Design a protein around this ligand. Structure first.
Ligand SMILES: *[C@@H]1O[C@H](CO)[C@@H](O[C@@H]2O[C@H](CO)[C@@H](O)[C@H](O)[C@H]2NC(C)=O)[C@H](O)[C@H]1NC(C)=O
Ligand SMILES: *[C@@H]1O[C@H](CO)[C@@H](O[C@@H]2O[C@H](CO)[C@@H](O)[C@H](O)[C@H]2NC(C)=O)[C@H](O)[C@H]1NC(C)=O
Ligand SMILES: *[C@@H]1O[C@H](CO)[C@@H](O[C@@H]2O[C@H](CO)[C@@H](O)[C@H](O)[C@H]2NC(C)=O)[C@H](O)[C@H]1NC(C)=O
Ligand SMILES: *[C@@H]1O[C@H](CO)[C@@H](O[C@@H]2O[C@H](CO)[C@@H](O)[C@H](O)[C@H]2NC(C)=O)[C@H](O)[C@H]1NC(C)=O
Ligand SMILES: *[C@@H]1O[C@H](CO)[C@@H](O[C@@H]2O[C@H](CO)[C@@H](O)[C@H](O)[C@H]2NC(C)=O)[C@H](O)[C@H]1NC(C)=O
Ligand SMILES: *[C@@H]1O[C@H](CO)[C@@H](O)[C@H](O)[C@H]1NC(C)=O
Ligand SMILES: *[C@@H]1O[C@H](CO)[C@@H](O)[C@H](O)[C@H]1NC(C)=O
Ligand SMILES: *[C@@H]1O[C@H](CO)[C@@H](O)[C@H](O)[C@H]1NC(C)=O
Ligand SMILES: *[C@@H]1O[C@H](CO)[C@@H](O)[C@H](O)[C@H]1NC(C)=O
Lengths: 316, 122, 225, 188
């Protein structure tokens, strides 16, 4: 049993163009309108990112129509899924491995909230386990059909070229090998080893970008001062013109650099959130024949778990 | 964000003013002419008169929604708002918690299977 | 079931004909590209009427009202303010072209794998078990018509993973052992068709004291005379 | 209801949607009916009428006298009816249209300009009749080049949505329109 971490979405933002460049300056509002429409572009780009984040979370998770449920008699021919199936005694619907994963990781700035809350994402990923266990791969191509679990696993062996008399003559050995490998995942994630490295660089690169956009509000750019209002109460209005025109032309380039480098960074999340949409369809909802796509070895099955702005697979 | 009084020397604090944003939820103009207005996170105490006061005031994590009625239904989402809130026009505009899908359960057992009998070409 | 399959395929093509001949506009992905290109061009057009701090947005009245000593100061602001708008337009077009190329590579993959052969990848060439596909064209795009296979009308049975006959296990070749309550049959996994359990469709391995859940029955032998 | 729309510029256009930042009469506002003192001249006055009752207008705080055909103030210029009076930049502007308040939509074509530059604060008529604000509209033109519809961009938020998209049909969705910020009350 291995582990595979992918990113899915990132932080939705939106920055108002007028208040960032000159908040509370009614003559700078007349100085900005000499530049046409450089502010309705930047709001239209930062809106196109923000909707695009709420489409990535939809196609990774929301792929079943129903919401299946595990039966109250959890007797699966020798296996033990109590680490990944949810238990209601916790204050959330969230399972045990996902609680180990939720611990390892203004001048115009507003952050929108997500659309699917973390207790809705955690109900999709409880439907995908509850169909994979009790119904095989039959719920990907129609309606779910029940099957015993040790008869499901018998002809997932029959795909990789091992005849089905091997599992029924070695059922209790595999169950002890399968239950042991889950526990070493729960050790090596709850230990001091920090495995969530890919999800952490999404979050850090969104803070280095906003620690710089605010830092540019203290640079004079060749003017007499960085404070906007103190230039106004120290100059004549026909000579306060050519001092604010170094700040407006300066502060446009700091918005223009921010929005572009957010657009290139947002494009490599779609390259990652379309790969997770494929591994959700081909690894989870069926057995895969592609070599080293779902794991490292011959492939049997997989189990999704959630994470902050990401997803985690467990390729058996 | 904090500064001493120069004359009487009491330490006092600074925090900025409101500064939210406006949104106008609307159905098609070839269906109605009634809108529901959402403000960006201003806690409904700091607010055109029907869209400024009156009834239908509702507090979301997305903001302060004025002009739609909170119900106890759960429907397929029509217009997104945020934090699992969707609004639609069914005659006035209602707001609710969006649903994920139909509840279902599978009769699992250690000795039963469900073979299909017919098919469908789609 | 050839005739039934033929009429179901014809009715499905007819319903696609109706759902496209109606005014349901499902070409949103083909329409958004045209809208984005036209809106970027309109913004680039309307940038010419800005003055950027100068005395006029037209070059000609500046040239006709001023002299080459102090007209160049007016011209320089307009040159910088138009270069920045060109550079912004070109950069965002270079970003959109990558999304279009990613969609074109996915369309080439689907044309190679769904049309020119049968696929085994789940939910790649349509949601279901895949049979074939048919390409159609469109303005700046392509449209596929995936022909899937969805099972229906299920029915409970009682199953068992083996058969102990004389202290030996008996597993199927390909199929499950099912039962209607009295007898026992081997049937394929996606369409209910029972058969008689012989030594032509089972095999044998070991003795029957290891398998967990084995069920007694009797194996027929096809060599009767 | 919907009255008092004129042509702010002498430029022809056709089949476009041009917005205008100019002084107009708002929509659905309260006008005073008189079934006759010197009313105040705020920044521009709308006026309509009914046969042969209304003669003229007395303006001024040099007081301006129009009859109906002129008296000076120092210059004389002899040349259901709706009128618009404006005192713009030291000029004086009159717009006009007559048709057979009603509830239709009719534009107002320009009539005369006067290069005088006088001082006016209140106005009086010379014997029914009916008695402007900074706004922003969205004028819809037609093939021949006349105004067929306009939308006030500060009446209700649906009109503000229609003025932001620059369209008269708004499909189903959610739209950002404006921003808000409370103002400082006193100085300290
Ligand atoms: C599946 O594993 C869990 C944890 O590894 C088992 O739960 C433990 O059961 C023992 C009973 O022998 C208790 O003493 C422990 O307190 C339980 N721990 C937890 C965390 O619940 C569970 O019993 C296993 N499943 C089965 C069917 O035995
Ligand atoms: C196969 O048998 C199972 C168990 O008898 C049936 O599941 C029950 O169906 C009834 C009727 O819809 C429900 O009220 C019960 O809640 C179901 N049981 C459980 C545990 O959910 C199932 O319907 C049968 N299959 C068919 C096709 O009839
Ligand atoms: C599988 O489903 C089809 C319907 O899609 C069934 O076809 C029907 O058969 C009955 C019996 O002759 C006819 O009266 C109907 O008119 C048929 N339907 C249509 C749409 O033509 C078919 O019988 C089903 N298979 C089985 C074994 O019952
Ligand atoms: C289970 O299926 C078997 C196979 O068809 C049924 O056995 C036959 O039943 C029919 C009546 O439907 C009889 O006419 C045949 O003679 C039976 N076959 C034999 C070899 O005797 C059986 O009846 C089914 N089970 C039940 C409970 O109906
Ligand atoms: C399955 O079949 C075997 C073979 O007949 C059964 O084993 C015999 O059962 C009889 C009936 O009680 C006993 O008298 C014999 O001693 C058993 N033989 C052996 C070698 O133990 C077996 O009991 C059957 N299983 C079930 C559940 O009926
Ligand atoms: C702001 O919202 C909280 C609830 O989250 C409420 O307790 C509080 O009273 C609100 N503030 C005001 C000024 O009403
Ligand atoms: C929704 O349920 C609550 C129960 O606490 C009830 O008080 C409320 O009236 C219900 N809403 C409507 C619209 O009936
Ligand atoms: C199936 O499980 C039940 C209890 O859940 C048990 O009593 C029964 O013996 C099991 N059947 C088989 C064939 O193992
Ligand atoms: C333009 O005027 C002509 C003649 O008055 C008329 O026939 C035509 O219909 C007008 N066009 C429109 C669009 O009203």
């Amino acid at each position: 049993v291995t582990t595979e971490i992918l990113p899915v979405s990132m932080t939705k933002t939106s920055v108002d163009c007028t208040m960032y460049i000159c908040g509370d300056s009614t003559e700078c509002s007349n100085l900005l309108l000499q530049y046409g429409s450089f502010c309705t572009q930047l709001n239209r780009a930062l809106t196109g990112i923000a909707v695009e984040q709420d489409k990535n979370t939809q196609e990774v998770f929301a792929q079943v129509k129903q919401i299946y449920k595990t039966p109250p008699i959890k007797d699966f021919g020798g296996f033990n899924f109590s680490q990944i199936l949810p238990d209601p005694s916790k204050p959330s619907k969230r399972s045990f491995i996902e609680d180990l994963l939720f611990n390892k990781v203004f001048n115009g700035l507003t952050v929108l909230p997500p659309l699917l809350t973390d207790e809705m994402i955690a109900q999709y990923t409880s439907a995908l386990l509850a169909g994979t266990i009790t119904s095989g791969w039959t719920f990907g191509a129609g309606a779910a059909l029940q099957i015993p679990f040790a008869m499901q696993m018998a002809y997932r062996f029959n795909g990789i070229g091992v005849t089905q008399n091997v599992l029924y003559e070695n059922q209790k050995l595999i169950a002890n090998q399968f239950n042991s490998a889950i526990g070493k995942i729960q050790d090596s994630l709850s230990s001091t080893a920090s495995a969530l490295g890919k999800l952490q660089d999404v979050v850090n690169q969104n803070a280095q970008a906003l620690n710089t956009l605010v830092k540019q509000l203290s640079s004079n750019f060749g003017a007499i001062s960085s404070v906007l209002n103190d230039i106004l109460s120290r100059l004549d209005p026909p000579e306060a013109e050519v001092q604010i025109d170094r700040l407006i032309t300066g502060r446009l380039q700091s918005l223009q650099t921010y929005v572009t480098q957010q657009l290139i960074r947002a494009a490599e999340i779609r390259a990652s959130a379309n790969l997770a949409a494929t591994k959700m369809s081909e690894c989870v909802l069926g057995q895969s024949k592609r070599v080293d796509f779902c794991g490292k070895g011959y492939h049997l099955m997989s189990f999704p778990q959630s994470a902050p702005h990401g997803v985690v697979f467990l390729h058996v | 964000d904090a500064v001493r009084d120069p004359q009487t020397l009491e330490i006092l604090d600074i925090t900025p003013c409101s500064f939210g944003g406006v949104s106008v939820i609307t159905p098609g103009t070839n269906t109605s002419n009634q809108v529901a207005v959402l403000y960006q996170d201003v806690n409904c105490t700091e607010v055109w008169r029907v869209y400024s006061t009156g009834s239908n005031v509702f507090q979301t994590r997305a903001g302060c929604l004025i002009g739609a009625e909170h119900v106890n239904n759960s429907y397929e989402c029509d217009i997104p708002i945020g934090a699992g809130i969707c609004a639609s026009y069914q005659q006035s505009i209602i707001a609710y918690t969006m649903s994920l899908g139909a509840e279902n359960s599978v009769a699992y057992s250690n000795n039963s299977i469900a073979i299909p009998t017919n098919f469908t070409i789609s | 079931n050839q005739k039934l399959i033929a009429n179901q395929f014809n009715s499905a093509i007819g319903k696609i004909q109706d759902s496209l001949s109606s005014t349901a506009s499902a070409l949103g992905k083909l329409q958004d590209v045209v809208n984005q290109n036209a809106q970027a061009l309109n913004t680039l057009v309307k940038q010419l009427s800005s003055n950027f701090g100068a005395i006029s947005s037209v070059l000609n009245d500046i040239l006709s009202r001023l002299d080459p000593p102090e007209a160049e100061v007016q011209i320089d602001r307009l040159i910088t303010g138009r270069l920045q708008s060109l550079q912004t337009y070109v950069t965002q077009q270079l970003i959109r072209a990558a999304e279009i190329r990613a969609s074109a590579n996915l369309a080439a993959t689907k044309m190679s794998e769904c049309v020119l052969g049968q696929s085994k990848r789940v939910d790649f060439c349509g949601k279901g078990y895949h049979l074939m596909s048919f390409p159609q064209s469109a303005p700046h795009g392509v449209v596929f018509l995936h022909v899937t296979y969805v099972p229906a009308q299920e029915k409970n049975f009682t199953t068992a993973p083996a058969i102990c006959h004389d202290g030996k296990a008996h597993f199927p070749r390909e199929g499950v052992f099912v039962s209607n309550g009295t007898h026992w049959f081997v049937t394929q996994r996606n369409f209910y068709e029972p058969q008689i359990i012989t030594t032509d469709n089972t095999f044998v391995s070991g003795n029957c004291d290891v398998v967990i859940g084995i069920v007694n029955n009797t194996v027929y032998d096809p060599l009767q005379p | 209801f919907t009255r008092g729309v004129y042509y702010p510029d002498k430029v022809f256009r056709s089949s476009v949607l041009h917005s205008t930042q100019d002084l107009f009469l708002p929509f659905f506002s309260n006008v005073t009916w008189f079934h006759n003192p010197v009313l105040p001249f705020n920044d521009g006055v709308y006026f309509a009428s009914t046969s042969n009752i209304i003669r003229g207008w007395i303006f001024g705080t040099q007081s301006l006298l129009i009859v109906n055909v002129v008296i000076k103030v120092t210059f004389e210029y002899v040349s259901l009816r709706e009128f618009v009076f404006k005192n713009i930049d030291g000029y004086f502007k009159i717009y006009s249209k007559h048709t057979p308040l009603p509830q239709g939509f009719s534009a107002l074509e320009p009539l005369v300009d006067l290069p005088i530059g006088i001082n006016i604060t209140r106005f009086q008529t010379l014997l029914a009749y009916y008695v402007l604000q900074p706004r922003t509209f969205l004028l819809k033109y037609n093939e021949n080049g006349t105004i067929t519809d306009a939308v006030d961009c500060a009446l209700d938020p649906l009109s503000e949505t229609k003025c932001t998209l620059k369209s008269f049909t708004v499909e189903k969705g959610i739209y950002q329109t404006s921003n808000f910020r409370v103002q400082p009350t006193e100085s300290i």
